Amino acid sequence: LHHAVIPHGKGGRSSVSGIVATVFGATGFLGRYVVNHLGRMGSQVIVPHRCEPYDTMHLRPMGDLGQIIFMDWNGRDKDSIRRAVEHSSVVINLVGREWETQNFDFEDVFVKIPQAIAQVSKEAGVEKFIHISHLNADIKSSSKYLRSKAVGEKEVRETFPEATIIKPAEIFGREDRFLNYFANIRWFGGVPLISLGKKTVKQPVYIVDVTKGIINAIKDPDARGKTFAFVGPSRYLLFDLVQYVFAVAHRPFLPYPLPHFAYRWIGRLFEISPFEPWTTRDKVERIHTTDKILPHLPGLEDLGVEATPLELKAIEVLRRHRTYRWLSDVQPAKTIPTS
Amino acid sequence: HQDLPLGLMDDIYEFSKNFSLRIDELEEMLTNNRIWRNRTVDIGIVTAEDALNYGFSGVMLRGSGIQWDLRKTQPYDVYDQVEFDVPIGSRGDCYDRYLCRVEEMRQSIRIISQCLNKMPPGEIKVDDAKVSPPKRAEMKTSMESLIHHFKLYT
Amino acid sequence: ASTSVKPIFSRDMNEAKRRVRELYRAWYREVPNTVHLFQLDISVKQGRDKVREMFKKNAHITDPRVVDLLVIKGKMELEETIKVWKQRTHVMRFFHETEAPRPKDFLSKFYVGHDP
Amino acid sequence: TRPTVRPRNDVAHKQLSAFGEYVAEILPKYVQQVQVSCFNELEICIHPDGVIPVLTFLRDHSNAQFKSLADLTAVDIPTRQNRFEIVYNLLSLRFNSRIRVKTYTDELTPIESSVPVYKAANWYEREIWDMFGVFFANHPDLRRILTDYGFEGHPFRKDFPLSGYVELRYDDEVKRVVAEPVELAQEFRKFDLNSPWEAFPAYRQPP
Amino acid sequence: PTVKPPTARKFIWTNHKFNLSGTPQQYVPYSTTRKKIQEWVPPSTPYK
Amino acid sequence: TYKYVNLREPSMDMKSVTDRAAQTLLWTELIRGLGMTLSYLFREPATINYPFEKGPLSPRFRGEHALRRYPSGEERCIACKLCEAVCPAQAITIEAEPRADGSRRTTRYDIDMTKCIYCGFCQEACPVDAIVEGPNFEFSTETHEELLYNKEKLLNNGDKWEAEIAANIQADYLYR
Amino acid sequence: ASATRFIQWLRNWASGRDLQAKLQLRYQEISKRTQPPPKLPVGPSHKLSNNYYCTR
Amino acid sequence: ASKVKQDMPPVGGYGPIDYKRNLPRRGLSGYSMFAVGIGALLFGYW
Amino acid sequence: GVRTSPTGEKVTHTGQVYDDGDYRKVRFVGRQKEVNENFAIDLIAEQPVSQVGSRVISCDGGGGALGHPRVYINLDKETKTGTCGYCGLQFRQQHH
Amino acid sequence: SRGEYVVAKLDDLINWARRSSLWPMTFGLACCAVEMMHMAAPRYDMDRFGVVFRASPRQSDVMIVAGTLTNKMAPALRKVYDQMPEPRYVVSMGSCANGGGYYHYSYSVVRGCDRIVPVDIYVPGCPPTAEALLYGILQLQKKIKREKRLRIWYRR
Numbered sequence A: 001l002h003h004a005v006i007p008h009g010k011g012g013r014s015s016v017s018g019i020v021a022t023v024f025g026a027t028g029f030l031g032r033y034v035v036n037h038l039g040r041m042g043s044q045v046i047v048p049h050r051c052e053p054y055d056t057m058h059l060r061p062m063g064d065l066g067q068i069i070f071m072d073w074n075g076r077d078k079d080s081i082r083r084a085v086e087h088s089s090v091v092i093n094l095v096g097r098e099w100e101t102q103n104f105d106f107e108d109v110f111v112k113i114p115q116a117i118a119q120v121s122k123e124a125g126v127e128k129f130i131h132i133s134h135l136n137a138d139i140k141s142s143s144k145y146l147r148s149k150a151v152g153e154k155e156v157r158e159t160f161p162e163a164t165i166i167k168p169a170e171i172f173g174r175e176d177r178f179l180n181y182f183a184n185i186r187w188f189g190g191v192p193l194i195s196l197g198k199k200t201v202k203q204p205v206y207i208v209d210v211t212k213g214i215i216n217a218i219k220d221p222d223a224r225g226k227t228f229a230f231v232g233p234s235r236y237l238l239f240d241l242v243q244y245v246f247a248v249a250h251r252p253f254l255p256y257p258l259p260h261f262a263y264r265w266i267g268r269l270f271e272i273s274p275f276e277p278w279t280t281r282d283k284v285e286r287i288h289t290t291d292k293i294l295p296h297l298p299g300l301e302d303l304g305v306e307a308t309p310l311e312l313k314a315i316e317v318l319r320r321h322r323t324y325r326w327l328s329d330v331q332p333a334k335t336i337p338t339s
Numbered sequence B: 001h002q003d004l005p006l007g008l009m010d011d012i013y014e015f016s017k018n019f020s021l022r023i024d025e026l027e028e029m030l031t032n033n034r035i036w037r038n039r040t041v042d043i044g045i046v047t048a049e050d051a052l053n054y055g056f057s058g059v060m061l062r063g064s065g066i067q068w069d070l071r072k073t074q075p076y077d078v079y080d081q082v083e084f085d086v087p088i089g090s091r092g093d094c095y096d097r098y099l100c101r102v103e104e105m106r107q108s109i110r111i112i113s114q115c116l117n118k119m120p121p122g123e124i125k126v127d128d129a130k131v132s133p134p135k136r137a138e139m140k141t142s143m144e145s146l147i148h149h150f151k152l153y154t
Numbered sequence C: 001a002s003t004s005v006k007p008i009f010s011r012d013m014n015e016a017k018r019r020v021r022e023l024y025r026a027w028y029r030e031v032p033n034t035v036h037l038f039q040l041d042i043s044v045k046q047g048r049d050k051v052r053e054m055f056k057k058n059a060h061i062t063d064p065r066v067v068d069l070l071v072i073k074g075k076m077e078l079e080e081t082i083k084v085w086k087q088r089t090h091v092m093r094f095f096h097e098t099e100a101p102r103p104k105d106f107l108s109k110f111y112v113g114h115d116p
Numbered sequence D: 001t002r003p004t005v006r007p008r009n010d011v012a013h014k015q016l017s018a019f020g021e022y023v024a025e026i027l028p029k030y031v032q033q034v035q036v037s038c039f040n041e042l043e044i045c046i047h048p049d050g051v052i053p054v055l056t057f058l059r060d061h062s063n064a065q066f067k068s069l070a071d072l073t074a075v076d077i078p079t080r081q082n083r084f085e086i087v088y089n090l091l092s093l094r095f096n097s098r099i100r101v102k103t104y105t106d107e108l109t110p111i112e113s114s115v116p117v118y119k120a121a122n123w124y125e126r127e128i129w130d131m132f133g134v135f136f137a138n139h140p141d142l143r144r145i146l147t148d149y150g151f152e153g154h155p156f157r158k159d160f161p162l163s164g165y166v167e168l169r170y171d172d173e174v175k176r177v178v179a180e181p182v183e184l185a186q187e188f189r190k191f192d193l194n195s196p197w198e199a200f201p202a203y204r205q206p207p
Numbered sequence E: 001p002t003v004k005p006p007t008a009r010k011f012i013w014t015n016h017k018f019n020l021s022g023t024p025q026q027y028v029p030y031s032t033t034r035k036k037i038q039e040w041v042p043p044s045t046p047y048k
Numbered sequence F: 001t002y003k004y005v006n007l008r009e010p011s012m013d014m015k016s017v018t019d020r021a022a023q024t025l026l027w028t029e030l031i032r033g034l035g036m037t038l039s040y041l042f043r044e045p046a047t048i049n050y051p052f053e054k055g056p057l058s059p060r061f062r063g064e065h066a067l068r069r070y071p072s073g074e075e076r077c078i079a080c081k082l083c084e085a086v087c088p089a090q091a092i093t094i095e096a097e098p099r100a101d102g103s104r105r106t107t108r109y110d111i112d113m114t115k116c117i118y119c120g121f122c123q124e125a126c127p128v129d130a131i132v133e134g135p136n137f138e139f140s141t142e143t144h145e146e147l148l149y150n151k152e153k154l155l156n157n158g159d160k161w162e163a164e165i166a167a168n169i170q171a172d173y174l175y176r
Numbered sequence G: 001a002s003a004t005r006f007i008q009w010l011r012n013w014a015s016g017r018d019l020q021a022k023l024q025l026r027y028q029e030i031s032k033r034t035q036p037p038p039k040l041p042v043g044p045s046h047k048l049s050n051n052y053y054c055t056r
Numbered sequence H: 001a002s003k004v005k006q007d008m009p010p011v012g013g014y015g016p017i018d019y020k021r022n023l024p025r026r027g028l029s030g031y032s033m034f035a036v037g038i039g040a041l042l043f044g045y046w
Numbered sequence I: 001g002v003r004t005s006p007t008g009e010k011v012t013h014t015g016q017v018y019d020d021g022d023y024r025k026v027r028f029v030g031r032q033k034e035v036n037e038n039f040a041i042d043l044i045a046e047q048p049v050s051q052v053g054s055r056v057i058s059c060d061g062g063g064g065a066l067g068h069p070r071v072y073i074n075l076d077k078e079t080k081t082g083t084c085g086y087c088g089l090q091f092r093q094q095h096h
Numbered sequence J: 001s002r003g004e005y006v007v008a009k010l011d012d013l014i015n016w017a018r019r020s021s022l023w024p025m026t027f028g029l030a031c032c033a034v035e036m037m038h039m040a041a042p043r044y045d046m047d048r049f050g051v052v053f054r055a056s057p058r059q060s061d062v063m064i065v066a067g068t069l070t071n072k073m074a075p076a077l078r079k080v081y082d083q084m085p086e087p088r089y090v091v092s093m094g095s096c097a098n099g100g101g102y103y104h105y106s107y108s109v110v111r112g113c114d115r116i117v118p119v120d121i122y123v124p125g126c127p128p129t130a131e132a133l134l135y136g137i138l139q140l141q142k143k144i145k146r147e148k149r150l151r152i153w154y155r156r
Ligand SMILES: NC(=O)C1=CN([C@@H]2O[C@H](COP(=O)(O)OP(=O)(O)OC[C@H]3O[C@@H](n4cnc5c(N)ncnc54)[C@H](OP(=O)(O)O)[C@@H]3O)[C@@H](O)[C@H]2O)C=CC1
Pocket: A024, A025, A026, A027, A028, A029, A030, A031, A049, A050, A051, A074, A075, A093, A094, A095, A096, A097, A098, A104, A109, A132, A133, A134, A135, A168, A169, A170, A171, A177, A178
């Protein structure tokens, strides 16, 4: 590397960080924060987008003049992928979807597309590669979402050997579908939960921690070929977590039990709409899948990030669900000890 | 900066000719309209002593009856060679100030007519190249003019 | 003599520190409802830490005229917050949330830039 | 009369010169220096303790009647021990004449507020405080008037940078407008325009 | 122009263009200067 | 001299009082205001059919910038940086060096059309009429970046509007 | 100025004045947009003698 | 060798320009207006 | 007179072109590189050398007030042509 | 014959409605607001294109930032932008709202409204002529005319 784009400045908006990053799937929940932190330091962020340009406008104020470059691409058009990665030094793959469409399904977005990005990046000459997977990824799970990520996770590690795979748990934030999803059950009266929300342990992680971890992995060369797992600082029962969410939102809470087979059936009629499904058969599985406890995988603390307690920043997400402007404290959710 | 282009003072005359009727139509809609009067009469009354002590100037003084205009008391340019009247209010409220401005729009047409009829010939910027830049024709043939053009713009 | 100077409010430090303490009291009692009225996302604990931290920085002062101005400015700052002239953005400009940490050790500065 | 030279007014110069001595003799306790410029503007330089006695005198005295505060501004001259210079511009409708009254202060020394003399000075003194940092005693309401809430510093002081210290942008992570240290895509280009050759020998200073 | 036609020059565009904003023909800025500092290129021959 | 605007005292005779009473009850002066708006309904509107009709301009108009050439193809700019030094907004950046043939010419000439105040001082200070502001005023963009002109963009503007820039200078160079 | 005499009567009557002699639209009384070239005067200092700068 | 030519008023100046207020006096008197108003009512009542 | 580089990018009249491993070529993906094709160094070299009978000639660029400041060029050096510093037009002396 | 064709004409209808009924909310801040009013004056008459002179934030489809944005005003601009129902566009008018302008190096001016809100059209000038803004408003219309919201939805 005789060029080695050299950082300049104090790390501000007009500075140069030397990072030329292509961020696929930059138009979603996780992309907003990743692109924001890159442009907040002076990175050249290429944002290949499939949606309408009107939906990329929130990404324009995130960088200085000319530091955010927008391109068109198709997940099945390798030529378009190459155009957006050939001039870069790090590729970030944040592509995903909670549901399956006629054109695209879980295999296409979690296996066929991520592999193409890695294969094109490898020959294009990209030295770094960040791939996001799920904490509960295995090829022996009811969820087809989680089954596909395990299949697609290994292809990235076999197509781009040095890639850095990050396996976050459920992420919560302002635009998340995890804590907002819980608070939006109120449109149907009670809150269905397999069992009574018991027998499920989850370790939610803050969106910014996932973002800072992704950014740190783009800097320290002790993450090439590694595999991380971003998990929160506390483990909660699903029943406790949902009750806490409704406590912050300050709304009636009437949980009732529901059989697993019955939950899927209502989860199939809610995935008939041709728009954003309110819930799906796959989405119900992931809510109740206890988060793994992989202790052999390095986590956030190794990359220099300190996991953010949910109690610290749960009001931030659930404020808008409160029906009163001010509302005049909620006791912390019962957390499973470390033992 | 530059002299007036040929055929401008004719257009100003054509415009100034019809502008009195335009103000008349403005007064047909507001001066004697009872809704306008009730929203501007006895509103914002200022005394002549408070107006002076609060730093007011212009119509904010003349509205309250103070007879003061810097064009007639401290003239500049050629304002002492033109004829015009200074409208003065009596009540000191919004309505009287609205009348002064309307009358000032008339007295301004009065001054423009005199300016068009008394415009003298000659240069339009001081003939002193150490203050005002020389003409481009001189700047491209005279060494001194080019030196002063260079310095006055750097 | 030349050292003679016109006071602002307080003629000596002991009378100047009374104004400082009165100003810490009003600030200490305004954080609770400043975090409520503005709908901030910071606990009242770290709110009073920020008030405490600001005062401590101007603790080496030993000139009553300097201290009187620091008190005068502080009450101007307090009035803006009490009367909600400040927006949520102004109140959170003390905490520097979006400024990345800048390590102060020599080696860290050596790798990043030329600044001392 | 040369067409490119401003004509003199010797009548005004003599009149304002006489009125300067008149004010100096009636207020020896405060008037430190009186000047009349070549374009006939009288400047009365006073001790800072004499803001109210002199402004009140010029406003009320039957031969002065300066009943209009045209402007009130400060000038920052760092070389001076008292770096600030408070300038009061007064107008007289009765006598159709103007006067200027100048005093001085520094960062830590209060100057008496003239709101009791001229109500116009209410906002002028807030601007001087906000932009220069001069504190005015007994002011009905002293605050920042022109600068952003919480702005730290006094922009019009000569040692304050042109582009400031902080700049604003919207941050999506916190969903609010945030302030960060100033960085400029193009630095302001400082021009050294002064010519090394003297231009006005009449204003030459001693060696 | 059918009465007082413009002067003809070699470099004047024969074909006019409209506002090309939003199209692939838009104007993308760049620096028109060359690199200022030339780095040292180490020898490709080993030693010892 | 001065004139009172509102010093008239209303008449207090029977006819005058009954005129104001009739005005109050019968709304006469309000009807007088309805007639004026009715008049405007039957006048010709002053609206021009944009973009098929354009508002009148003059040869002095200060619009988009351009870099000119002599009647030879050679650039008029000789990198004197007088325009750079007078730009009130500091919207010009110039770098120069001897050309291959030894001619004093620029290697960079950037105008930041977002700092520019469209004031005309650059074309007043140019001793060779190199930089001018043309009549074009319709060059709105969808991105901020493409309003940061470099030498190539300005030269293209000159080669694109020269037929019109030359005629305007011809119609106004005897004033300037 | 193309309004028929009937509409002209109506607008004139309603306003209360002759609107046809003071139209707010310009037709042909405006100066031609092409004018003969000028030849501007020169200032008082354009002399070849008795014109030393220190005297002005 | 033509003479000076700058924008000047035509020899003799421009025609007079009106500026004073010209609000006309139009309508009937207060007496007549009430007469027509009362006349309408009586005919209407009839 | 462009001299397109091996990577297919036009070289402007100032010699500016992006190297292979330069990340700033990405800005031209989906767009174009604005380059003015009329090089002033090629067009002024194809202007005939004027022949004059005087050792000194004056150039004002043509047009008088519309040209450039009037300069006087010397022509006593036979080994080279006299060049104008503003416009580049060249002048030679007939025989002496 | 194809769902792409049917979903495309139905997309033109919504584009045509949104392009032909733009209701701006002018943020008159500085001198450029004067040239924005001249766009509503009789000569140009923005109202004839379906562009109403003035509307409230919740009834507005486009924000026109006409004038200088200061550090003390920036928080208010974003608040009104957030409260604007979607779809919402921004037109940046004048040098001050584009890159700071004459006041670029000031300590109290935001160097461009694009640091605060996304910008769809930039109108250059100081001030842009009332006709130059109307060109910018008519250029925003062709942007909406070129949107493919329903096309892109049909191919997800
Ligand atoms: N957010 C969460 O809760 C969790 C996220 N993850 C992982 O993070 C990644 C997604 O994060 P998140 O932001 O929440 O997802 P989002 O639903 O918010 O957005 C998904 C992104 O991927 C793009 N996308 C989806 N399908 C396609 C397609 N065929 N072609 C091109 N782009 C497509 C979308 O583009 P567009 O919409 O514009 O068409 C969008 O930019 C995934 O890898 C996921 O496994 C892991 C743990 C928790």
